[PDB]
Structure 1
Amino acid sequence: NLRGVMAALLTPFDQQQALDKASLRRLVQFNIQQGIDGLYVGGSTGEAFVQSLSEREQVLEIVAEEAKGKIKLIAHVGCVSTAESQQLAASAKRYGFDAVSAVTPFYYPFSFEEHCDHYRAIIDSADGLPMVVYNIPALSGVKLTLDQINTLVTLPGVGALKQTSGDLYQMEQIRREHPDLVLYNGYDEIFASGLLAGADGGIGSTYNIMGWRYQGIVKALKEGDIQTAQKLQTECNKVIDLLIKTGIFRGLKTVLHYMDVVSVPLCRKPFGPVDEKYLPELKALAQQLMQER
């Protein structure tokens, strides 16, 4: 079962921008400890697009060694290139991941038929692991229609859709057309509303530092406690407001650093460092979250 609340994993680096293996392992265990349902590895949040294929494979392998069998593992193997995506898909299979995922190839304009074959090819290389289609127009620049999304999710081998879109009319339409589809809400800031619209879970960057809040929203809605669901979402959004100001990945890494999970809170260039004017708020947030749970 792929339904659930899963954190989009960050990739810790050292002062020289190389992978910090010890912090990667610590972050994986940290997520498992807070009760996350699984991890989405090698996606936007893992800074995969500023990593080489071998670096992405190194991360996939380490995460699997640390969490395989404990929580669900989804490997985002998407690249612009189909061949590169296939290589990562085959490696994900070798490492024992539960599923693979791929963002719609970007930069170059591709036809819908080309997108479809891209997914089919990756699915073939995944050799048995279900595919999680990844729709994120804001970053990819690829704007799919409802009909096209329906076609992609019905392709043989596709078992889920990560929907990073704020269009909750479309979210409802997708659920209506696919009653059994695993549908992950992609924008943390509308999680509650996304679930109400039809999503049955979610994948997000902020889950790394407060995943229990999202689990709390799932529970609140299940119990019909709208008040609690809204309060939790509101608190999540106060945090998201901050992270958007500071820079999301580096802000999260900085909080995790103050929690003693991540040794060095740096992202790879061109991402810059966190503006020191935000440290007081980030330190206070880490303290608050550590006390909270």
Structure 2
Amino acid sequence: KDLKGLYAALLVPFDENGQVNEQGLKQIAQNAIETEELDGLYVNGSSGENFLLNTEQKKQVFKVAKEAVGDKVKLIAQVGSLDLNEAIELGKYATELGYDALSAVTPFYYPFTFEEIRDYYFDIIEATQNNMIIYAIPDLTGVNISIEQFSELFNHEKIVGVKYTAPNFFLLERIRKAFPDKLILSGCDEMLVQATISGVDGAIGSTYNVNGRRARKIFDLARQGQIQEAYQLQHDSNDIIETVLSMGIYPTLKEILRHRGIDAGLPKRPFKPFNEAHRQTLDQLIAKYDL
């Protein structure tokens, strides 16, 4: 499938031992598609606490998310890992389940050269034969990819695009102009309106789990040139984002989901659960914005 559109970065509920709550995960997946009216799920991304999981758990999440949704839902599998053998194992697994594309975070922690980064992507693709989306998130990885480095990556026909989670709108514009044929999905929910007018083909976000209807309006109105109306909705969305960030984003988003009757569980340690000192403020937010 063509991969344009709006995606929930799927959140994952855990128990107190860091085990996946499969029933809750199914509910979250269904919420994203049926209630928030999104186009797809981006599975085992940062938002899903993926980097805290073991391999079996990642496979479990891929399977449960796939089983939770209908065949018209777009599915992107984030398989990036510092363990290339694991990335390949997961990529093959997701591909076999029928995920529409793979995605992989740029290798982090170690100071890998660009050549080492490039060939990580190329090795995953060679082993899986699926399409690949680069996941660039410099604020967490410390890895910056230049316009010239993107050119080298985008030379590969199976590197179909990028999930761009970075604040630099000059770089985004240069990417958009240089690669009109590639897919660009923005990852900064708080800058969706600016990303939209910068020509992104869609967006992937944790907050779309609770605010996906509003996000769609921002995206659509901005492209229809109802920019003031789009920007007003971005103000509202950014009230939400600022609030959940101040309370701990992944556990807070899952608490908003619990209010909808979802078995939203716990974050995976060492993340701590939502602090009940924030409960009153959260309830006021949910009330104000009908979350």
TM-score by length of 1: 0.95
CA deviation map 1:51-93 (0-9, x unaligned): 0011000110111112251310000000012111000000001
How far has the Cα of 1:49 moved from its partner?
0.7
Question: Are 2:165 and 1:164 aligned?
Answer: yes
Q: Equivalent residue for 2:272?
A: 272
**Partners of 1:164 and 1:20 in 2: CA distance:** 28
Q: Equivalent residue for 1:147?
A: 148
> 3-state SS of the aligned residue for 1:224?
coil
Question: Are 2:41 and 1:39 aligned?
Answer: yes
Amino acid at match of 2:239: K
Q: Equivalent residue for 1:108?
A: 110
Question: Structure 2: where are the runs of 5+ without partners?
Answer: none
How far has the Cα of 1:282 moved from its partner?
1.7
Preserved CA contact (<8 Å) 2:9 2:209? yes
Preserved CA contact (<8 Å) 2:7 2:42? yes
| Larger mean Cα displacement after TM superposition, 116-125 or 149-158 | 149-158
How far has the Cα of 1:244 moved from its partner?
1.1
Preserved CA contact (<8 Å) 1:14 1:263? no
Preserved CA contact (<8 Å) 2:254 2:264? no
**Partners of 1:62 and 1:220 in 2: CA distance:** 33
Question: Are 2:95 and 1:72 aligned?
Answer: no
Preserved CA contact (<8 Å) 1:81 1:105? no
How far has the Cα of 1:286 moved from its partner?
3.1
> 3-state SS of the aligned residue for 2:41?
strand
How far has the Cα of 1:143 moved from its partner?
1.6
Question: Are 2:173 and 1:190 aligned?
Answer: no
**Partners of 2:213 and 2:180 in 1: CA distance:** 26
1:1-293 matched pairs, under 5 angstroms = 1-33=2-34, 34-127=36-129, 129-264=130-265, 266-289=266-289, 291=290
**Partners of 1:84 and 1:207 in 2: CA distance:** 28
**Partners of 1:117 and 1:173 in 2: CA distance:** 23
Question: Structure 1: where are the runs of 5+ without partners?
Answer: none
Preserved CA contact (<8 Å) 1:255 1:285? no
Preserved CA contact (<8 Å) 2:192 2:219? no
Amino acid at match of 1:95: L
| Larger mean Cα displacement after TM superposition, 181-190 or 193-202 | 193-202
Amino acid at match of 1:187: C
Amino acid at match of 1:105: P
**Partners of 1:243 and 1:154 in 2: CA distance:** 39
Preserved CA contact (<8 Å) 1:133 1:153? no
How far has the Cα of 1:156 moved from its partner?
2.9
> 3-state SS of the aligned residue for 1:267?
coil
How far has the Cα of 1:195 moved from its partner?
1.3
Runs of 4+ in 1 over 6 A off after TM superposition: none
Preserved CA contact (<8 Å) 1:258 1:283? no
Amino acid at match of 2:259: Y
**Partners of 2:56 and 2:77 in 1: CA distance:** 14
Equivalent residue pairs, number: 289
TM-score by length of 2: 0.96
Amino acid at match of 2:131: P
> 3-state SS of the aligned residue for 2:94?
helix
**Partners of 2:223 and 2:109 in 1: CA distance:** 40
> 3-state SS of the aligned residue for 1:162?
strand
State the identity as a percent.
37
